[PDB]
Design a protein around this ligand. Structure first.
Ligand SMILES: [Mg+2]
Length: 301
């Protein structure tokens, strides 16, 4: 796994090629600019970005660039590249600030996801992240001890030395969560992370159980964990989540190993749901916060 410098390397290679050709054109004119936008738009469609979002990006770049009469002192090939960079950041950016825990407060974070989302590993990763930043953090499994994800979260918590709460008798996941959050609030924890059952294929049953547990524990933030390998079909998925909760965040997994990561990122951003982290592998530190400007910076660098 040495081949690429960025998860969107194939998209980035096509965009930097387009931009290099424009910066090397002997004269910069509308034909040269349009040739570049064509290559950029095509690369984004080949990354499974939705046509509507690709058409809007092109509009925006053409609206930002005024070739005919232009500012004295500007390098106009550089201005065009900055216009494209800026519009690529917008394309993966929700336009909205994500919720963050407050220091000195108790913060309850509830996870939801469909089967195959990587929800449960993502829980321990978020806990490790906050534990490493000096927060007193804990995990609750609001699920039956017979579920595979119960042992999974417990063994992950043990290795990381993160306090874990599950029940070895209680059948009702709502009661489990309530009891778990009560215990950890009483023990002065700052970050309290609640994993729910991931054994849902349909949104219907997933969002049903989601509201049951939400109402019981009053979470400060709900994180939807999504498999990004479905590309732009992430939009409908993210919209339905966002319409059902007030304080909504998304963590994307499976962003690698396929060509559709740009589509997935831009679909979620199109719903104005902020992706807060990316899960990048099997290990507990395979995890990174999602910052759009540095993300696009590293891609085109
Ligand atoms: Mg945007």
């Amino acid at each position: 796994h040495h081949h690429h410098h960025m998860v969107l390397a194939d998209l980035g290679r096509k965009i930097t090629s387009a931009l290099r050709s424009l910066s090397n054109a002997t004269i910069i004119n509308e034909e040269v600019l349009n040739a570049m936008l064509k290559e950029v738009c095509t690369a984004l469609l080949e990354a499974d970005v939705n046509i509507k979002l690709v058409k809007q990006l092109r509009e925006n770049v053409k609206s930002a660039i005024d070739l005919e009469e232009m500012a004295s002192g500007l390098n106009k090939r550089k201005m065009i590249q900055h216009a494209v960079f800026k519009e690529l950041v917008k394309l993966v950016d929700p336009g909205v600030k994500a919720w963050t825990p407050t220091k000195g407060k108790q913060n309850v974070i509830m996870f939801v996801g469909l089967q195959g989302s990587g929800k449960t590993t993502t829980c321990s990763k978020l806990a490790y992240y906050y534990q490493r930043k000096g927060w007193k953090t804990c995990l609750i499994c609001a699920d039956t001890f017979r579920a595979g994800a119960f042992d999974q979260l417990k063994q992950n918590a043990t290795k990381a030395r993160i306090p874990f709460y599950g029940s070895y008798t209680e059948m009702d996941p709502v009661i489990i969560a309530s009891e778990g959050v009560e215990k950890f609030k009483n023990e002065n924890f700052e970050i309290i992370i609640v994993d729910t059952s991931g054994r849902h294929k349909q949104e219907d049953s997933l969002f049903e159980e989601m509201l049951q547990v939400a109402n019981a524990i009053q979470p400060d933030n709900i994180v939807y964990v999504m498999d990004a390998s479905i590309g732009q079909a992430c939009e409908a998925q993210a919209k339905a989540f966002k319409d059902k909760v007030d304080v909504a965040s998304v963590i994307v997994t499976k962003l690698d190993g396929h060509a559709k990561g740009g589509g997935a990122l831009s679909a979620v951003a199109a719903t104005k749901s902020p992706i807060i982290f990316i899960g990048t592998g099997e290990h507990i530190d395979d995890f990174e916060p999602f910052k759009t400007q540095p993300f696009i910076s590293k891609l085109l660098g």
